[PDB]
Design a protein around this nucleic acid. Structure first.
Ligand SMILES: [Zn+2]
Length: 18
DNA sequence: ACGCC
């Protein structure tokens, strides 16, 4: 499933570079 | 940023 911070796949919002 | 995986 996807990150929602960026909308990319296979990592977690809390930690997002974006 | 939050939640889930
Ligand atoms: Zn992300």
């Amino acid at each position: 499933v996807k990150c929602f911070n960026c909308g990319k796949e296979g990592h977690i919002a809390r930690n997002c570079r974006a």
